[PDB]
Amino acid sequence: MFENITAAPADPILGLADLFRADERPGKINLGIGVYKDETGKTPVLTSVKKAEQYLLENETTKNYLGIDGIPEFGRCTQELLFGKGSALINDKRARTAQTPGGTGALRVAADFLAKNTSVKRVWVSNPSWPNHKSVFNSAGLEVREYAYYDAENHTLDFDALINSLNEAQAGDVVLFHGCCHNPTGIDPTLEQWQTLAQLSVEKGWLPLFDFAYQGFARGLEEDAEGLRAFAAMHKELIVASSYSHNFGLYNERVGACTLVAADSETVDRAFSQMKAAIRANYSNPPAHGASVVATILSNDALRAIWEQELTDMRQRIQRMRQLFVNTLQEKGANRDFSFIIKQNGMFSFSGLTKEQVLRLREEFGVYAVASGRVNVAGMTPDNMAPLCEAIVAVL
Amino acid sequence: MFENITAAPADPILGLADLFRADERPGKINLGIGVYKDETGKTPVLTSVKKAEQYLLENETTKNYLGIDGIPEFGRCTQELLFGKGSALINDKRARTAQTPGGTGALRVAADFLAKNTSVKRVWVSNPSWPNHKSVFNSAGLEVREYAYYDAENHTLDFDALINSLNEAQAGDVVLFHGCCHNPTGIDPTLEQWQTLAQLSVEKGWLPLFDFAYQGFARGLEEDAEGLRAFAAMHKELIVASSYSHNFGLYNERVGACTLVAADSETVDRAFSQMKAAIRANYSNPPAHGASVVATILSNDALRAIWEQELTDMRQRIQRMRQLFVNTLQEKGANRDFSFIIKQNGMFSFSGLTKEQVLRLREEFGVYAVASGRVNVAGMTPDNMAPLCEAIVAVL
Ligand SMILES: Cc1ncc(COP(=O)(O)O)c(CN)c1O
Ligand SMILES: Cc1ncc(COP(=O)(O)O)c(CN)c1O
DSSP states (O other): OOTTOOOOOOOHHHHHHHHHHHHOOSSOEEOOOOSOOOTTSOOOOOHHHHHHHHHHHHHOOOOOOOOTTOOHHHHHHHHHHHHOTTOHHHHTTOEEEEEESHHHHHHHHHHHHHHHHSOOOEEEEEESOOTHHHHHHHTTTOEEEEEEOEETTTTEEOHHHHHHHHTTOOTTOEEEEEOSSOTTTOOOOOHHHHHHHHHHHHHHTOEEEEEEOOTTSSSOTTGGGHHHHHHHHHOSOEEEEEEOTTTTTOGGGOOEEEEEEOSSHHHHHHHHHHHHHHHHTTTSSOOHHHHHHHHHHHHOHHHHHHHHHHHHHHHHHHHHHHHHHHHHHHHHTOOSOOGGGGGSOSSEEEOOOOHHHHHHHHHTTSEEOOTTOEEEGGGOOHHHHHHHHHHHHTTO | OOTTOOOOOOOTTHHHHHHHHTTOOSSOEEOOOOSOOOTTSOOOOOHHHHHHHHHHHHHOOOOOOOOTTOOHHHHHHHHHHHHOTTOHHHHTTOEEEEEESHHHHHHHHHHHHHHHHSOOOEEEEESSOOTHHHHHHHHTTOEEEEEOOEETTTTEEOHHHHHHHTSSOOTTOEEEEEOSSOTTTOOOOOHHHHHHHHHHHHHHTOEEEEEESOTTSSSOTTGGGHHHHHHHHHOSOEEEEEEOTTTTTOGGGOOEEEEEEOSSHHHHHHHHHHHHHHHHTTTSSOOHHHHHHHHHHHHSHHHHHHHHHHHHHHHHHHHHHHHHHHHHHHHHTOOSOOGGGGTSOSSEEEOOOOHHHHHHHHHHSSEEOOTTOEEEGGGOOTTTHHHHHHHHHHHO
16 A cells, blocks of 8 residues: 555645755745744743743643543633623623634634535635645535635735625635735735625625634734624624634644534534534544643733733734835835835735745845745844845845 | 534443533442543542653743654654664664644544545454544545454454454455554453464455554553564554553643554655645644653653653552452352453453443442443542442342
8 A cells, every 4th residue: 555655745835944944054034934933033932821831730630631622711711802702602602612723623623514514515715825724625525716815916905806706606605714914915804894794795695714813913802803703793603713823822732723603502502512523533632731821821810911911012023024124125225115014914925026036035045935925024033124125125 | 504403422431421420429430431540539640741841841942833743752752662662664764653633633644644645445443442433434534344353252352253354354455453452342462363463464455553542551561562563573564543641641632643654765755745744734733742741751761760660550550450350249249250350451341241230330329331331440449349349249
């Protein structure tokens, strides 16, 4: 068996890594990373997390299994971050949360739940989107279709082309929205647009699936769910997949959740059971450590105070780099307007460079970036900003 | 969309615990648990585990992602544990290990790998088996078929019906073997019987899949891998799904591995990349905490020393409760020979009790058992042994 299995193709983001740690020549800049890096270039453990991990060390008495849905307090804190402090969704008891292995595991259990219990046969994702959205939905047996999103010329949300591509989508199709900090584009709808899409979605019959992986990195924790909260205001049913990988620095402990809301509680209880059946045939029940660290910090006023300040300085660093990048491009002599970098959100933006420009940048040296011209702004430091900008100007 | 989604039935194992908690009776006994419980009735955190968690607390500088296959020495260590330190499979670089969320996770990853890359279509599981076996394989789109195993009349392995049901069972069918401590019977093949099944497995063309959830709980760490090792001597190809939930008491940190062995190095690397492609569309990369704890313990000779003793104490406690159960039973008047209980391994046995006697023990007494009559011997203490045997003697 296996004698003739063909290799899997190299995961585009994930293959640049080894080319980088193989280059080993001097002042290399890797901007194809998917994680936050500080001014040192390190991805530290938040000290709010180090303080909650020692409370757990000293307080845990069992590593017995968690329920299929995970830790209760985890679920409740997630519903308050997503829908806000006193919403009807929470008080009417219309939402159920299964703690999950990361934002990806959330996507995948929604997908198995949806493939196995509904008539959904499609999901519309944006062009472009995180590459792995096509593969997780596809591995569940769903067809993924692409709506338009980006304007390659003006560097914006081509709203008129997104509405228009979306008009081909039928009722009972799921449409996938990135809740804030769009990967790879960083371009996000205004509240006025989110409300347009909300209303259009009610009347055309889409099921909304929000993927909320960077809450806190564009504007702020609540501001960032303004979009999800306008859909939630008017939808009877919707699904939200989130991740605490980026805002808690908890990448490898696999921390995310998958929230179901339905019209009332007895329906969402009946549907969450089939969601829970999906989890049990997948990994049985979730990793406790990282979700325990998330629920400890969010449950306690002192730790949550320190965490919000750690999320704030990460947000503010990215914002300082976006600004310091288009100013250094200006004074080192760039002949294109990069102002648009300042209008986009979170760690990613398309620099607007050609495939052959990113290949020459890497080979004629030093700057590594995703072949799409995607650049992670958190890989820039005041120290490497001038050699990086040096090289981008030298290839324009 | 979720309006007419139907409930999903009570999980056989899971749903009993509620019934118990919620019964609020006096001296009640729960033998429907699936975790080790000590003499006092609790599932503690191993001392060696708590020492590696302080080591990690003090030493981790980042929670940046793990590769798709997780921690390398985690993988090296489980290959030596499974196949012994000088195995040709290791020296010839014929096996690849991916770290997964638990043994359930390992089994869903093998299933998605087989279902979407291979031609498998069928996997044969013993009758009876752990009930969630059928659900992980069915969720990936594979038929599960049953082979006979257990003789109710003599309480043994009737090898003749097992060998006879694995006939025909087409070349290229998957056959799942519990490596040691068969759940639910505790009935295991002898080394002559493992060697016969190995020989008949290469004659016939089957793909063996070992579920290895309890290594160390029958007669030893190494004694318990003789079966697998007897197949691994003769096969070109083999999959192993192991869990570190029980022998390390790390139930909820989801620690398990999925090992692929193919006939040589180049084939396992081409087949393992499609395995990684299956992982990446599921949860993307594995929970780091529980597996970091298993690699710190197994790679530090001091800690490994304390752990093997902790593991040994748990094996011996279960061996004592098995003797103490048939003894107390013979003294309280027990009408039937229960000596077979001592012949079986690990934490489970079928008590040989009727669905109606199992409800008699719950409704009239405090004894909770799964309706198959499966009891977990680790839920017995020197203390409750005699109220428990008085109740089953009353229903015989
Ligand atoms: C848009 C998006 N969705 C999901 C994920 C996956 O999140 P996680 O790392 O929590 O699995 C990411 C992160 N790579 C993402 O950017
Ligand atoms: C035979 C068998 N296989 C796999 C598993 C799953 O182990 P885990 O809880 O680590 O996923 C168990 C335990 N429930 C088991 O008994």
